[PDB]
Amino acid sequence: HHHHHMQTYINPPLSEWKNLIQRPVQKAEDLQNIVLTVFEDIKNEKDKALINYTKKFDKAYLTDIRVSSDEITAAIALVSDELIQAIQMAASNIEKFHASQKENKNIIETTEGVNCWREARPIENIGIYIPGGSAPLFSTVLMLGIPAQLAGCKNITLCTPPDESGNINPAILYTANLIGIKNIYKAGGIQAIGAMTFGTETIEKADKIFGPGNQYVTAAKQIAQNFGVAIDMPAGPSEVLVIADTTANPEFVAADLLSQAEHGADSQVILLTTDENILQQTLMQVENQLTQLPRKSIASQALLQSRGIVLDSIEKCIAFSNLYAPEHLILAIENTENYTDKITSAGSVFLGNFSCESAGDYASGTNHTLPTNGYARNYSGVSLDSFIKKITFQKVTKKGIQNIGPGIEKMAEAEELFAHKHAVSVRLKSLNS
Amino acid sequence: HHHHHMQTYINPPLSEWKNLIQRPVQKAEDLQNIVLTVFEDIKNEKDKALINYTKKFDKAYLTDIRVSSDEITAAIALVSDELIQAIQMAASNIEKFHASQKENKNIIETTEGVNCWREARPIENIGIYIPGGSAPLFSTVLMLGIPAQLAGCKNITLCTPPDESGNINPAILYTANLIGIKNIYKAGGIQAIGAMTFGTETIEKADKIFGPGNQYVTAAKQIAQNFGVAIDMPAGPSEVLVIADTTANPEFVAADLLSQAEHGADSQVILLTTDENILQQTLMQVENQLTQLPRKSIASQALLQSRGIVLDSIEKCIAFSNLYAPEHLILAIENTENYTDKITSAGSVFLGNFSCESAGDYASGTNHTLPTNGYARNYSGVSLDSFIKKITFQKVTKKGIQNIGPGIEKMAEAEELFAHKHAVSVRLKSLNS
Numbered sequence A, B: 001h002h003h004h005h006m007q008t009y010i011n012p013p014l015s016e017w018k019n020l021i022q023r024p025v026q027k028a029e030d031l032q033n034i035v036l037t038v039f040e041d042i043k044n045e046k047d048k049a050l051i052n053y054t055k056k057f058d059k060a061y062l063t064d065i066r067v068s069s070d071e072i073t074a075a076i077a078l079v080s081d082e083l084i085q086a087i088q089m090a091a092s093n094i095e096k097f098h099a100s101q102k103e104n105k106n107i108i109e110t111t112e113g114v115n116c117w118r119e120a121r122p123i124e125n126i127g128i129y130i131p132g133g134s135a136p137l138f139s140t141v142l143m144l145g146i147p148a149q150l151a152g153c154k155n156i157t158l159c160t161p162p163d164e165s166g167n168i169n170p171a172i173l174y175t176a177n178l179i180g181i182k183n184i185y186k187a188g189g190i191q192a193i194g195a196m197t198f199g200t201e202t203i204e205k206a207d208k209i210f211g212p213g214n215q216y217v218t219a220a221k222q223i224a225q226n227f228g229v230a231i232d233m234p235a236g237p238s239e240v241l242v243i244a245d246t247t248a249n250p251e252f253v254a255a256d257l258l259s260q261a262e263h264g265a266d267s268q269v270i271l272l273t274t275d276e277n278i279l280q281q282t283l284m285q286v287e288n289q290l291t292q293l294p295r296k297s298i299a300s301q302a303l304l305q306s307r308g309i310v311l312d313s314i315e316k317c318i319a320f321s322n323l324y325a326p327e328h329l330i331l332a333i334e335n336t337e338n339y340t341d342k343i344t345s346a347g348s349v350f351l352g353n354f355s356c357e358s359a360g361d362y363a364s365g366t367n368h369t370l371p372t373n374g375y376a377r378n379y380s381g382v383s384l385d386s387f388i389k390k391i392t393f394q395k396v397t398k399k400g401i402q403n404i405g406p407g408i409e410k411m412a413e414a415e416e417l418f419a420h421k422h423a424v425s426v427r428l429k430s431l432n433s
């Protein structure tokens, strides 16, 4: 009479893996006309459109779009001392890890007299979108704001929608103010993305927009690309894949699965085990722990689309994981150092029984803004790299151009580009003269 | 009675810069329905669609889509010994510079018992598009194929359209075969992009597609993103901005401008000088050199949209350049080391009188696949980074989770994510027990 929440597959053949790696289907609504209409309103009516759309969708009639300093001060006083300490602990770890990603200038002499190198420069105008609601995901403010600051980005904008009384959750404002974000705007949805894409009287336009959101925000960011703005990565629901052998702790594994499942009804979790007893013990823990979750309804909906799979070796589990390309990968196995080289697609990886995903979500220092829905095949998580341009430099000397010059002339000839050839020829004749 | 090709502006006010940074307008045709129709045909008819569209647009009725080994061998014998030597010289320099971009693993202890790091992994399936025509831009094969190989990308596909006899230019095939690309397909245009986006019987689908093309290829790459593939960067016509003081060589500067102008009628060049005499001498050189260009008609059309501007200091020229954000920047000035830190947006930078753009186009080692039309504000040129994912790793010890655990619990509580809190709690209670 037991109500099993997650479906299981015991040693499925390789011919079924194509089906077992599938995420749940997503909504197929065409939002292009909806987005383009909002964008046209933002282009034509600017701040008035922002206020009008906020009235319509957030049920708040604002006078000012920008969060005031009194509102920031009021928010600071509403954050407890213990939370302040935790946020500062997280910010320090995130700052330390992202600061380590800065590269040293490295001048390469490719051939005699030819020196080449790269240098980073910040993307000047950064836009950050933060969804609203009663539960503030203020940790995303740290994840996106801190590397923007470290990169040297001069203008950081944060948009987040008000509640019906016009207010922003105090933890969001506290956290943004902590890391030095001063341009905070009461705006959500398509209209917020449009404001950062085209600019209004109050919001200067962004060069690149960061941060996930719902289906409407996702479509708006996708379409905004066609008007010249860059975006961080494509969006989708969050997910975890866990690999567990006999050394895994079933209580820990169940808690990790449920931590991902409680994010949303569209989340997906995958458990790969090397024997059935680990699977059975972990599922028993899932059932028992699920009863205690305030969000048990949401996690239960995500578990319907989730899968537990028994595969007869860790190397087979890794091969399945590499085909799935998970946003988060937990290796709950012995001697992970023997296996990490074999991982080829995963957004972020957690090693051994004490590396829980919650730690990466909040405080370890890695970035939790990660590619989902298989985008780990072709994107990275947000990092310092996301906030800079790498400019290439070269300095060719007189000996340098005498060295590579004749070869360039022959290639330009073959491409039938006479002016390209002549730009070399005039240098060579000048030194020969 | 002189026919001046380029328009000049002498000390324009700062209020006019907004207008002087504008590229020429681009075509505003809506190609979405056109692209989606081809994509539907590729999805439904696969190789048959590839052959049918090739018949229609390339006027070649193919039997085989894949270039054969006999065709590769025939192409090798049609490339001269002197060109072979030049291509190998270029490949060596490109390989050396891109190999230097590999990062070392760097384990960061963010706090006691918490170790975080990143590792690169190749994007597994790479697609490269190379336009056809009588003038083979085979240098792009080196620029995209070499870093793909260095990254460890296992499956590299190259699509390039046949001529009416079904043939591919021998320099393209020679160069692709040289750097180890074995999967070469006779296909162009929207249908080639669609084949790499969805896959056919002959062409395995790509995870990321590289390489610029015409308006149709550009729209296809943009729309292909919505079906899950990554692309290198947005497209547009090529451009150069030159900054010249009294130490510049007007013959060299004119040749550099004309080298960019001969690329296409939609190209744009910008010359900034610190005095009018440099401008006048350079324009005289442009007029005289233009008469000798086989492509003088194309360069003349690009010069119509080009601008020469006198500004009264190098720092003003740099500020103009930073607003323009050029694909290529040439600093034809004294003591460039005093100015490169002030450059904030540019795709690739060339220093001093002997650093011509042709050298970067062909042989210096930097990548010539660069962001144009102002995309240097928010994208980089192609590099080793373009072909990899940077996966984050963390290993938290028992002491580590005891260290950051309580803080995570408080933040999870504030985000009302009880399962996130519980995933930490079970570890702490286990060690406390």
Ligand SMILES: N[C@@H](Cc1c[nH]c[nH+]1)C(=O)O
Binding pocket: A102, A103, A104, A105, A106, A118, A119, A120, A121, A390, A391
């Ligand atoms: N070393 C570079 C930083 C960089 C990042 N990527 C390439 N270069 C600098 O001086 O800014």
Ligand SMILES: N[C@@H](Cc1c[nH]c[nH+]1)C(=O)O
Binding pocket: B102, B103, B104, B105, B106, B118, B119, B120, B121, B390, B391
């Ligand atoms: N050091 C990494 C390479 C890397 C690039 N970016 C981050 N890490 C490795 O072992 O592959």
Ligand SMILES: [Zn+2]
Binding pocket: A259, A260, A263, A358, A361, B420
């Ligand atoms: Zn989470």
Ligand SMILES: [Zn+2]
Binding pocket: A420, B259, B260, B263, B358, B361
């Ligand atoms: Zn060129």
